[PDB]
Amino acid sequence: SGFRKMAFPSGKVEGCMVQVTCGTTTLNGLWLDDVVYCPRHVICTSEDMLNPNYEDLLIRKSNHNFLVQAGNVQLRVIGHSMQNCVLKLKVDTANPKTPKYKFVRIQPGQTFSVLACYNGSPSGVYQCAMRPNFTIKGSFLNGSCGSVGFNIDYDCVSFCYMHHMELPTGVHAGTDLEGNFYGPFVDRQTAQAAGTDTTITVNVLAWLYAAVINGDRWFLNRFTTTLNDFNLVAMKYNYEPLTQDHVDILGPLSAQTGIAVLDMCASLKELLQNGMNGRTILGSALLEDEFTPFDVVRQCSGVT
Amino acid sequence: SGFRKMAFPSGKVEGCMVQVTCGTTTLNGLWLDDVVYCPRHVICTSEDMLNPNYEDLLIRKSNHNFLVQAGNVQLRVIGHSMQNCVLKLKVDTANPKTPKYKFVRIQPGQTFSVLACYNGSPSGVYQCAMRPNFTIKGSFLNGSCGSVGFNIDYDCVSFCYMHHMELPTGVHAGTDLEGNFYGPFVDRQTAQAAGTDTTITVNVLAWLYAAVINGDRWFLNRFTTTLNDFNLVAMKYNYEPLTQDHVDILGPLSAQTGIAVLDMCASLKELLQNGMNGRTILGSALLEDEFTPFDVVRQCSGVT
Ligand SMILES: O=C1N[C@H](c2cccnc2)C(=O)N1c1cccc(Cl)c1
Ligand SMILES: O=C1N[C@H](c2cccnc2)C(=O)N1c1cccc(Cl)c1
C-alpha cells in the first residue's frame, strides 16, 4: 500500500546523456545509436535568440563546431542536420549503452518521467504530465535544455519530450524527439503565453480509484450522476469533459474496486462543489491529476 | 524555475539490484562488491513470521539454499551470515556495476530516494523522508522487500534504507544497511504501532524559501517572531521544535532571499494559525515537509 508520484528508473536514459557545446552555448544532448539529438538553439547566442534565423545560423557552423562530450570522452561529429527544432549530430561511434527505444508524440494528459540534466550530467528524476495546454510544470534551470521526458515498457524506452524553454510564467515548453513543439510555442525569446490549463478529469478519477484501493474512502458518497450532468460541473470548474473513451480506460479500476465510473464521477462532483473541508486524499489537500489510469494500475500491481 | 519532488537518478542503484529466493520466498537483494544484502525474513515462511527465531531458522539453511539471480544469470553463494535484520550472502563474483558507495544511518527528517523493486527488477523511483517516528510513507507492495533508499554525492551512493515491512497503518518500516531498524520495529508479523508523527519544521521552512525563490510570495507578511514564540505554535500544531541548528542550516536560503529565518517563521506561524484560505504554495494545498534545506539549495542551483 501507499501512493507516490513515481518516476521510471532513469538508468537507461542516464547512459544516453551527453553534453553539446556550440560556440559558447552548452546544453544537453541525447546519444542514441550514432546520433546525438539536442535543441537547435545550441547554435544561438543571446543576441540571436530575440528573432533567430536558424537556417542562416546553422550555415555558419561545421561538424567541428559541435563539441559532443560523453562523460569525459569526446565524440567525433561526422554529420549535422536540422529536423524541425532539433539538431541531429551524426557521430562516428554508436552509444554502447543505447537501450531499446522509440520516439513517441504523447497526448496531452499523458504522463512521463523527466531526467533533468546540466552539462550532460543527470541531477534528478521526477514524474510530469503534458498539460492540456501543452506545457509541463517541471523543474528546470538554465542549462537544463536537452533534458528528456520518457516512458518505459519493460526494456523499451519511449522518448516523448525534449526540454527547450521556460515561458515567463515559469512553465516549460519543449518538443517531441522529431523537433516538433508541443503546443503553439516557437524557440524564440519572445513573450508566448500558454492557453488556459484545464484539469485532466480522467486522471483525477484514476487517482480517486487509487485512493479507494489504498484506504482513503471518506469522499465516497450515496450519489451517482450521468456524463452530461458531470460535464456541466467539469466545465464550470475548468476540468476536461469526460468521454466514453475515458470511462472505458477507467474500467479496470472500476472492476477492481466495484465502484461504477459514474458513481466515482458523483464523488468528484461533490468534491468540486464542496471542497475537501480540510481533509486530505492520499496525502494531498487538492485533487491530483498527474496520474493516468495506466499509472494507477501499474503502481497498484507492481509492473517492473 | 519550478519545484518538484525530485529523486536522484537511479542508474547506479539499478545495477546493484538482484533477486534473492530462499525456499519459496522471493525478495530483492543489493549486490555490492562480492556481497548480496537482503532482509533476513527471506528465510521465513508465512507460518514462521508470527514469532520467528531467525537464528534457529538460519541454521536449517546452507549457501545452496539461497538463490541469487542478477538479471538472467545466477550468482554462486560461498558464504552467508546474519547481521542484525539483514543477511549478507557472499558471492564468488564482484558486481562489475558496483558504484562508489557508503552505508549511512540517516537522521529522522532527512530525505532519500527509493528504487522500488519486484523480483530483483526496478519499477519506479520516488523521493521520501524518514519521518520523525522513523517510518516512511512509501509505495510498496508484497515483493518490494529488499528495495533500498539512498542519496548520491556526485559519484558516491550512500545507501541509507532497506525496506522490510508495512505496518497495519499502511506506513513502511525498514533498516539501515547494517540491518538495524529505524525506530522500535521488529521483523515480525505482530501489531506494531508507530508513534505520533510530527511535521519536520526545518523542511517546511526550507520549502517556503523554495516557494519565495520560485515566485510564490503571497504568504510573506509584515511580522516576525522568536524561537520560543514560534515553538509554542509548533508544539500546538505537532511540528518539531525549531533549534538554532535548524536556523543555521537555513542560513544559505535566508541569505539568497534576504528573508531572515525568524521572519519566515512568522509567515509559517500565520499559515499554521489561519490555514491556506484556499490558496496553494508550489502547487500544494498543504505545508510540504519532505524537502530538506540541502534539497532546496541543490534543486535551485542544479547540482549534478
Ligand atoms: O536557453 C534557454 N534557457 C532558459 C531556461 C531556463 C529555465 C528552464 N528552461 C530553460 C530558456 O528559456 N532558454 C531559451 C530562451 C529562448 C528560446 C529558447 Cl528555445 C530557450
Ligand atoms: O513479507 C512481507 N511483505 C509485506 C509487505 C507488503 C507491502 C509493503 N511492504 C511489505 C510485509 O509487511 N511483510 C512482512 C511481514 C512480517 C514481517 C516482515 Cl519483516 C515483513
Q: Across-strand partners of A82?
A: A87
Q: What is the 3-state secondary structure (H, E, C) of chain A?
A: CCCCCCECCCHHHHCCEEEEEECCEEEEEEEECCEEEEEHHHHCCCCHHHCCCHHHHHHCCCHHHEEEEECCEEECEEEEEEECCEEEEEECCCCCCCCEEEECCCCCCCEEEEEEEECCEEEEEEEEECCCCCCECCCCCCCCCCCEEEEEECCEEEEEEEEEEECCCCCEEEECCCCCECCCCCCCCCCCCCCCCCECHHHHHHHHHHHHHCCCCCCCCCCCCCHHHHHHHHHHCCECCCCHHHHHHHHHHHHHHCCCHHHHHHHHHHHHHHCCCCCCECCECCCCCCCCHHHHHHHHHCCC
B299 with A124: Cβ contact below 8 A: yes
Solved with: X-ray
A51 lines ligand 1 (CB under 6 A): no
The cell numbers describing B178, all together, are 547494517
Q: Ligand 2 centroid to A27 CA: how many Å?
A: 44
CA A189 – CA A168 distance, rounded (Å): 10
Q: Ligand 1 centroid to A147 CA: how many Å?
A: 12
Q: Ligand 1 centroid to A102 CA: how many Å?
A: 26
Output b/e per residue, B136-158; b: 16+ Cβ within 10 A: bbbbbbebbbbbbbbbbeeeebb
Strand order in the sheet with A17-22: A73-75, A66-70, A17-22, A25-32, A35-39, A86-91, A77-83
Distance from CA of A299 to the nearest CA of B (A): 8
Q: Ligand 2 centroid to B164 CA: how many Å?
A: 6
- Identity (one letter) of the amino acid at B174? G
Q: With contacts defined as CB-CB under 8 Å, which chain A residues touch B126?
A: 4-7
Of A9, A115, A144, the CB nearest to B124: A9
Distance from CA of B79 to the nearest CA of A (A): 29
Q: With contacts defined as CB-CB under 8 Å, which chain A residues touch B115?
A: 9
Distance from CA of A304 to the nearest CA of B (A): 4
Which of 241-280 (B) contact A at CB < 8 A?
A: 275-276, 278, 280
Domains located in chain A, CATH noted = 1-14+100-197 (2.40.10.10), 15-99 (2.40.10.10), 198-301 (1.10.1840.10)
Would you call A123 an interface residue with chain B, using a CB distance cutoff of 8 Å?
yes
A145 catalytic residue (yes or no)? yes
A164 lines ligand 1 (CB under 6 A): yes
Q: In degrees rounded to 5, what are phi and psi of residue B153?
A: -110, 100
CA A178 – CA A83 distance, rounded (Å): 6
Sign of CA dihedral B31, B34, B40, B45: positive
CA B90 – CA A70 distance, rounded (Å): 35
A88 lines ligand 1 (CB under 6 A): no
**Do residues A299 and A6 lie in contact, with contact meaning Cβ atoms separated by under 8 Å?**
yes
- Identity (one letter) of the amino acid at B3? F
Q: Which residue CA neighbors atom 14 of ligand 2 most closely?
A: B165
* Active-site annotation holder among A22, A128, A145, A265: A145
How far CA A254 is from CA of A246, B67, B90, B163, in Å, comes to: 12, 39, 47, 30
